[PDB]
């Protein structure tokens, strides 16, 4: 395994799902019965959107969006009144990558905060985000389509599933991406839920550098069969994103 | 839509 220093850390890229990344996501409308109110707050951007946006910032691409996207929220979502349609006019977007900064401490201009919030909202819409206090998506299969069809990434973009490869061939694909300066979108599921994140480096000893999309919390080196950040889990036990794994590779501009 |  070659040694590759964290590609996103090298560029200062550290996004999250809350403010100021979520300033353009839908505003929660209803209290879910039995829960405390989140009414009037923006929904989380969704880990799938945060992982994808960090990769797009690594490339500063595209300058122009390619195709609009529309979808309808599941009628089972208790945070919104139904029906609820969401639309992102991506075909009209001119993203200014000088204003979509690599990270945000709070002192940035409103223009800079709105620039990253517009990217996060467009990416989230393009992956059919189920918005809420937490926000979920199907992930990889939607990410690969959105990157190519809505954002104009190369036809090299595609989903790979862990179950279709040996461990060696799986890791060799991850390593080839990293050798080409191409951070990898990655997800999995397990006993602390499902999550999406970015693989962006390697230490030569079969651990990979992971950016979890929580602003830096838990980022570090992990084996791909023990993607187990200590920031999750209540009660003291173990858990990680080790099942039903998939990735989106070949992520580079047209 | 369970990847969060």
User: Coil, helix or strand for A146?
Assistant: helix
Residues A157, A56 contacting (CB under 8 angstroms): no
Selected for mutation to probe chain B from A52, A72, A130 (highest B CB count within 10 Å) is: A130
Q: Which residues contact A107 (CB under 8 A, 6 or more apart)?
A: none
CATH number at residue A80: 3.90.70.50
DSSP helix/strand/coil, A238:
coil
A77-81 long-range Cβ contacts below 8 angstroms, 24+ apart:
A77/A130, A77/A131, A77/A132, A78/A30, A78/A32, A78/A33, A79/A28, A79/A29, A79/A30, A79/A32, A79/A38, A79/A43, A79/A131, A79/A132, A79/A133, A80/A26, A80/A28, A80/A29, A80/A30, A80/A131, A81/A29, A81/A30
Q: Per the structure block, which two tokens stand in for A202? A: 């390697």
| CA-to-CA dists, residue A194 to A3, A125, A136, A185, A197, angstroms | 28, 19, 9, 14, 10
Query: What domain range includes position A36?
Result: 1-254
Examine the residue annotation and report whether A14 is marked as an active-site residue of this protein.
no
Q: Which of residues 20-79 of A touch B (CB under 8 A)?
A: 44, 46-48, 74
Q: Is A47 a catalytic residue?
A: yes
* Nearest chain B residue (CA) to A214: B4
Residue B4: list chain A partners with CB under 8 A.
Answer: 44, 46-48, 134-137, 193-196
A69 contact partners, CB below 8 Å, separation of at least 6: A87, A88, A90, A122, A125, A126, A146, A150
**Do the chains contact at B1 and A47, CB–CB below 8 Å?**
no
CA distance A100 to A216: 18
Name the domain count of chain A.
1
The closest of A134, A211, A87 to B3, measured between CA atoms, is A134
Residue contact A187–B3, C-beta within 8 A: yes
């Amino acid at each position: 395994q070659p040694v590759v220093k964290s590609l996103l850390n090298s560029k200062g890229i550290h996004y999250n799902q809350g403010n100021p990344y979520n300033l353009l996501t839908p505003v929660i409308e209803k209290v879910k019965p039995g829960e405390q109110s989140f009414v009037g707050q923006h929904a989380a951007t969704g880990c799938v959107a945060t992982a994808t946006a960090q990769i797009m910032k690594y490339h500063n691409y595209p300058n122009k969006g390619l195709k609009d996207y529309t979808y309808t929220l599941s009628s089972n979502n208790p945070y919104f009144n139904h029906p609820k349609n969401l639309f992102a006019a991506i075909s009209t977007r001119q993203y200014n990558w000088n204003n979509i900064l690599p990270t945000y401490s709070g002192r940035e201009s409103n223009v800079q905060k709105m620039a990253i919030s517009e990217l996060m909202a467009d990416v989230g819409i393009s992956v059919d985000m189920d918005y809420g206090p937490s926000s979920g998506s199907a992930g990889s299969s939607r990410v690969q389509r959105a990157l190519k069809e809505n954002f104009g990434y190369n036809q090299s973009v595609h989903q790979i599933n862990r179950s279709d490869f040996s461990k060696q061939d799986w890791e060799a694909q991850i390593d080839k991406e990293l050798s080409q300066n191409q951070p990898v979108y990655y997800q999995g599921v397990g006993k602390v839920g499902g999550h999406a994140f970015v693989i962006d480096g390697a230490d030569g000893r079969n651990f990979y550098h992971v950016n979890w999309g929580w602003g830096g919390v838990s980022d570090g080196f992990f084996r791909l069969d023990a993607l187990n950040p200590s920031a999750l889990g209540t009660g003291g036990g173990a858990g990680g994103f080790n099942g039903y794994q998939s990735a989106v590779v070949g992520i580079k501009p047209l | 839509a369970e990847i969060x």
